[PDB]
Amino acid sequence: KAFPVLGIDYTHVRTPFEISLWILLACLMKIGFHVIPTISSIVPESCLLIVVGLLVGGLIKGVGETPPFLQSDVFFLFLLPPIILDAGYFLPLRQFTENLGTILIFAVVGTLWNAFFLGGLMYAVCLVGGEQINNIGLLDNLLFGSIISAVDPVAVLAVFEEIHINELLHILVFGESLLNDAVTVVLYHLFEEFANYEHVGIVDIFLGFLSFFVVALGGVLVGVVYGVIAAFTSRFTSHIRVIEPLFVFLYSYMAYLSAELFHLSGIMALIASGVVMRPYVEANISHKSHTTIKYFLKMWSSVSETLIFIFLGVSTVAGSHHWNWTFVISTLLFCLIARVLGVLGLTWFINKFRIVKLTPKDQFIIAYGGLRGAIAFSLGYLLDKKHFPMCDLFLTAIITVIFFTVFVQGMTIRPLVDLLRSINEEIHTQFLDHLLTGIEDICGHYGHHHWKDKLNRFNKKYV
Amino acid sequence: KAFPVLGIDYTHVRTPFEISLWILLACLMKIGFHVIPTISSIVPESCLLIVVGLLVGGLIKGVGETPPFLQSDVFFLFLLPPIILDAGYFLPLRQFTENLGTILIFAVVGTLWNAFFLGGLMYAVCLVGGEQINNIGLLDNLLFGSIISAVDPVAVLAVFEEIHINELLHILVFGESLLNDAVTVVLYHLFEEFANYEHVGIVDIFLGFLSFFVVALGGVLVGVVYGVIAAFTSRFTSHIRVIEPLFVFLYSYMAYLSAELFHLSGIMALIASGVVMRPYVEANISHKSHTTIKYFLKMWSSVSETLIFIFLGVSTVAGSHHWNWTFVISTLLFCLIARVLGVLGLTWFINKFRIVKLTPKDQFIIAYGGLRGAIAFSLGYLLDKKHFPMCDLFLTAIITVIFFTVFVQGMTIRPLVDLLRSINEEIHTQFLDHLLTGIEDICGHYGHHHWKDKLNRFNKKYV
Amino acid sequence: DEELEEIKKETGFSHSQITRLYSRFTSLDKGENGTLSREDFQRIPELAINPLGDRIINAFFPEGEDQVNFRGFMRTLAHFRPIEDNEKSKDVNGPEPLNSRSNKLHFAFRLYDLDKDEKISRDELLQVLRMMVGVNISDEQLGSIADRTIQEADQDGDSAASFTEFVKVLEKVDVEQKMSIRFLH
Amino acid sequence: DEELEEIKKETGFSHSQITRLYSRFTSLDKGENGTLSREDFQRIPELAINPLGDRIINAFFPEGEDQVNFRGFMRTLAHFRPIEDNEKSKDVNGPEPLNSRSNKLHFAFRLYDLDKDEKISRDELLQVLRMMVGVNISDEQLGSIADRTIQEADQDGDSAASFTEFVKVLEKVDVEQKMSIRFLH
């Protein structure tokens, strides 16, 4: 072996080198996606991720490499918490807690409605469907409904602008996307366990109903504990500042792993930890370190979403498919109907319980514009084959729903929704505002203003 | 199983959770290391890393967990390139290329001298040592000498200040640490392959001599190729700016993996890629993104060094030890003597070939102050047991050398070296400067000024 | 059940809203004899912090009397009851409801006006602005803001154009959303 | 071998340094007859860019003659030869070497001085400063800098204190390192 060291050993660097190649290709298409004059405001970013995944999967198929896969430990530990923490860190806590009621209604109740409505209707279709969609059952199909209701409406916000997206709809879709990705994972684990009980009684249904809230709220509690710890330890990192971002990421990640340790909701723990630490940081942290934290979250979430959509591409062009016309067409149509019915019903229920109503503009955007991706696919991809023997059909339905809801429901929402400050004003605005508040404080109904003032008193006390 | 989802599954989150715990402990000690009034300027940062590793290893030993280990793929692919890229990115290219001759002399030639002098003297000791250090041989012992000469003098710069560290000594130790970590890894792979030839002839010695330069310069060539590519693609990332740091990290990492693919010097490729891209970025990249890149490199290198020193702690308090008094004492004494002799001889050789001589101050700092760590340990820890049956003795010697060179040679260098601008001046300075230059341009000797002016003409031409 | 219907006709609330308000009333009574007075309002923890706080305490009161009965509290508080479209839309004869688009901005003018002389003036605007803003900001700054608002608002020419123009410059500002309170049952 | 020893005594170089310099000399001769002239120096690519470039071309020249021979180039260039301690230290009688701490700063003064009248003056400083700095910067700025340097430098009282004080304010500035060139063999 002349020239001893020299070699061409490529097995040593395949996973890191090819993952770097994928992230490089996705980044190069992003810098080839914002240079086209007006295309970032016509087509969502998720479409670019889909197309990048399709090209990478096509390259993998053409070369002949065995396509890589999510290990169901890399997703739930290394690829999910980036996305969740990026989403739930820059949550506008003011707007989020002002109308927290409607956000919780949409996210939790609308996600449960989507999940159970899709489960029931897909079960009804399977019962009366061909011999290759029978024997799916209820729990195996209700789990599919819960997976496919993991929806990301906030991507549609990229297609709009400051106009048509008020501070109400923006926070509504933002919180809906967050807590929907939380509730769908909670339901995913719940149904994935219920699908091996072989006897689901009423007592088991009640226990699952309790465990839903126990998982979610235990995640919230772990998150606030780690957020308080991060808020405290951020006061002392003024001496060494390149460690300031690291403490935020470490404490959020440890909150996620402490929630997932006890099988609580890691996503809700991540969200709660970020939301708790954010106000008490950015005041104890320098501007440079806060700007970094922002950049870190953005690009690390972008890398994670890129990787998820690359896996989607490689499993849609180079994977196993079990296309069923009845199941796939029914799931497309029923996802649209379940989403629309949930949005309409819940908006009707909550307009009468609030001051600022939800216009048909934002009702249409929420109902038509909730687009799947990067969590629906990954949740439906990590389904076992031993359990859920039909999981290839579920993957085909989920991929078709993602493509239809991103390319047809996201590329045809802006050209489908536009067709369906004097000095006085300022003075008076502040005036009416101080007026209403005083009045609300006189009547006394314990709305949200009272709670926020109590929160502020608590904050002062701590400080 | 009441409350279905709830569980206490900890095997799922052990590696991520415990690595997060370790990084959190190291960060908490860093924010407990800069709050003590005057201790960051008395004891180096490497001592804090050693102590953090010792505490984490002690906790692992006390609990009873099986101690984790470097997989020799995680180090050379995920833990080394952070450190190398952080070091070689903020390389002050001006000062580095001004006196490039002396930096290359120290790094390459002094590292080779340290490696071969330690190999020869340790071989001489083993030949006349006890029956448990015989049969080590030359190549197995010359490899140990090359591993233990992976030295990091720049850590000592933390103990000094702007005074006592001029722009010459600072760049000298910086480039020495970089290219020493490069040359020691090149020699490590070279000797680790030569240790299975069972017949090393003169033709094999010459082939290894050629392959040293082939590996190093092929790494440099791959690095400049990827640096040119990154410089080009940085012109177009103005539209999307959260991807600007990602392109730097991706292109440097791909340079590293392309060099390691062909078994070339990945470290030199990383250094060359960073050095090439840096001038042509930070001009095409916004200030926020450059500040991020800086923060990313600093904290990601800090995490990698933390992890390496944690592994050092767990393998020194909870590992296998083969302490030999002759070998360990001889290697301590001979590391000190080899370092001192190399520094003295090379400084004497290069003072006569330059204008600004090296004072006994900086000669003492380079000779006494080159402290091992985080690459010496890791290189000497990934040695096989099949090959190199004595590798436990090598690990014990390397750990002892790290502890002695960090705690005795780094804590007793500041209290061992302090005891052994009118308007005119400014005008005249610039004047004499413009004067000398003109003169050097008249005489014509092709020094470095000429080369730099040619480089500038080339840069203009490109732009 | 007490007498509630006549206020349920005068104000226009429902029964549960009135019951909850009367509950808060009894809680804030801190004594039956001071059914409701100025000090009774002043010792509410938070409104006194509000810059307009004192004006709000005297804005309910019809005349110089220092006592408010429950029914008068209802009459003054109804001004905020949200405008209900079909129910403002069902029968049209006279503006019996006090929560109208007119009465809602009239409460604003009565809160601005020093006395019930319908005179918003540079003194009035300057006083309320100095209340809403802190004491630190320059009087010349407040002078500029207040007199600029007077100038643009005044189409009367006497710098007043007080109510009729108040409505016109606030018409651009939806008050149906801005100034109304939903009182939970 | 040509005549080299007498320059090796006059200048104090070694033999290889002189050989390499003569090689560069022949390369820059671009013709034997113009052994070395003003234009011959001007067409060197880079020094003409240097602000002091023209002064350096006329600084070698002893007198108004427009030709430089090789030996004169050696005499003028030796001024930069690095001071060698033991070899400046071995025999002490008279300052035969021109590379001394005195002659090195005398070349500087001869480059500043307009003529060889030893007169650094506000005109001299202002001219050289306007050369080193660009043309954009204010003449009042240059006036401030130049006259402040004159004031601090001048202990003569005539604003000159030209050479004797030049040495004193530059003594704080090591010229042994700053102004000398090692000529590779």
Author numbering:
A (entry chain B), B (entry chain A): 87 to 506, 516 to 558
C (entry chain D), D (entry chain C): 11 to 195
From the paper:
Sodium/proton exchanger 1 (NHE1) is an electroneutral secondary active transporter present on the plasma membrane of most mammalian cells and plays critical roles in regulating intracellular pH and volume homeostasis. Calcineurin B-homologous protein 1 (CHP1) is an obligate binding partner that promotes NHE1 biosynthetic maturation, cell surface expression and pH-sensitivity. We find that NHE1 assembles as a symmetrical homodimer, with each subunit undergoing an elevator-like conformational change during cation exchange. Each monomer is made up of a dimerization domain (TMs 1−3 and 7−10) and a core domain (TMs 4−6 and 11−13).
To investigate how the NHE1-CHP1 complex is activated by protonation, we prepared a sample at pH 6.5 as well as in the presence of 150-mM NaCl. Three-dimensional reconstruction of the corresponding NHE1-CHP1Na/6.5 dataset was similar to the NHE1-CHP1Na/7.5 dataset, resulting in a 3.4-Å map for the transporter complex. Subsequent 3D reconstruction focusing on this class without an imposed symmetry yielded a 4.0-Å EM map. Two helices were observed in the cytoplasmic region of the NHE1 protomer, termed HC1 and HC2. Whereas HC1 shows extensive interactions with CHP1, HC2 is amphipathic and presumably binds to the membrane surface. In the NHE1-CHP1Na/6.5 complex, HC1 and HC2 helices are perpendicular to each other. Moreover, the two CHP1 molecules reside at opposite ends of the rectangular-shaped NHE1 dimer, by interacting with IL6, HC1, and HC2, resulting in an ~30o angle between the CHP1 molecule and the membrane plane. We hypothesize that absence of the HC3 helices in the NHE1-CHP1Na/6.5 complex model is caused by the splay-opened CHP1, thus releasing the HC3 helices from the TMD dimer. A large funnel between the dimerization domain and the core domain in each protomer is accessible only from the intracellular side, indicating that in both pH conditions the NHE1-CHP1 complex adopts an inward-facing conformation. In the context of inward-facing NHE1-CHP1Na/7.5 and NHE1-CHP1Na/6.5 complexes, the CHP1 molecule exhibits high mobility relative to the NHE1 dimer, resulting in featureless CHP1 density in the EM maps.
